[PDB]
Each structure stands twice: as C-alpha cells, then as structure tokens.
Amino acid sequence: SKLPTGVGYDWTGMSYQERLSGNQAPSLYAISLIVVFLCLAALYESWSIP
C-alpha cells in the first residue's frame, strides 16, 4: 500500500486458493458435532445420553 500510485496487487495460484478458504475445520467439525449430538440419540432415544 506504501508504493507509487497506479501500482496494485493480486494473489495467484496457491496464494489465490488460500483466499477462498484455508480453515473451515472449526465450522464443519461443529456441524459434525451437532449431527453427532443428535444422531446418536436417534437410537438411545434419550436426552443427553449421547
């Protein structure tokens, strides 16, 4: 940002990719954790037993 005007930037390749997402693990392990909290009870038929 501290360079002459008219100069800008962009990321490519690996850099470009890491932009889309690098870490979704905490989201999809979270949904893993809820679909697990409930799918077990789909047999234990129990509150909190899972």
């Binding site: 005007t5 008219g6 800008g8 962009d10």
Partner: protein
C-alpha cells in the same frame, strides 16, 4: 451470480481512477430480485403467524399451536433440499411457487393434529392412544390425496 461477479471485477478498479472519475448504475435488474424474494419471505413469515392465530383461535391452547407451527418450516426448507437435488434454482418462479406450497401443506399437518384432538375429546384417551387411533382412520387418505394431487 454474474452481476455479483461484475461488482467484484469492478470493485478492484476505483483506487487507480484518475481524478474526478466516478461510477454510476443507471440500469440494474438485481434489486428487483433481492426485493422479489424479500417480499415473498415476508409473506411467508406473516403467513406462519396467521396460521398460528387460526390455530390458537380454534384449539385455544398455547401448547397445541406449537405442533402445526413447527411442522411447516420443516416442510418448506425441506423443499430447497429436494429441488436443489433436481438442479432447479431458488428463482423468482420457484420461490414464488412455494408460498402456494405453504398454503397447501399447512393443513396436511393440521387435519391430523385436529383429528387427534377431536378423537380424544369423547373417548377421552391419552395423546398416544388417540393419535394412533387417528392415524388408523386417516393415514391412508394422506398418501392418496398426495398421489392424486
């Protein structure tokens, strides 16, 4: 999505514009569609309200009215799932179609919730015994109404 890409493609440009030069959007289809879906979503919510009012006004109990209310969202979003799996989009037409869908579907729920109510109101048997009995006299109707429809 294309327009969404176009504001992106273009959002990177302004910092290197010369002095005095500014963008402007004289013809734009999108906010029509943002609004078209805003309006239907709001009709849907207020419909869910109105259903819950006719439910209270008829079963006269806070508890009873939770049942058919909960069952509607499950149906309607459930539809996104299945029409996603047939390659259909959440468009003007489709999204608009499901309001009618909400309308039809609500009673699929209530006919049975009610029928159980009315059955327990004379032989006076618990919710289990009554709802089971209720399934016995109707459940067969529900598949066929659905088939013929």
């Amino acid at each position: 999505d294309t327009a969404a890409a176009i504001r992106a493609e273009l959002a990177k440009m302004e910092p290197f514009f010369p002095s005095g030069l500014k963008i402007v959007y004289p013809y734009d289809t999108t906010p029509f569609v943002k609004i078209s879906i805003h309006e239907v979503v709001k009709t849907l919510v207020e419909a869910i309200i109105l259903v819950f009012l006719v439910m209270y006004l008829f079963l006269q109990n806070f508890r009873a009215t939770l049942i058919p209310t909960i069952a509607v969202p499950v149906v309607l979003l459930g539809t996104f799932a299945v029409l996603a799996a047939f390659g259909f989009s959440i468009n003007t037409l489709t999204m608009f179609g499901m309001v009618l869908a909400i309308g039809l579907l609500v009673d699929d729920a209530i006919v049975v919730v009610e029928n159980v109510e009315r059955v327990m109101a004379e032989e006076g048997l618990p919710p289990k015994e009554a709802t089971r009995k209720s399934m016995g006299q109707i459940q067969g109707a529900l598949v066929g109404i659905a088939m013929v429809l």
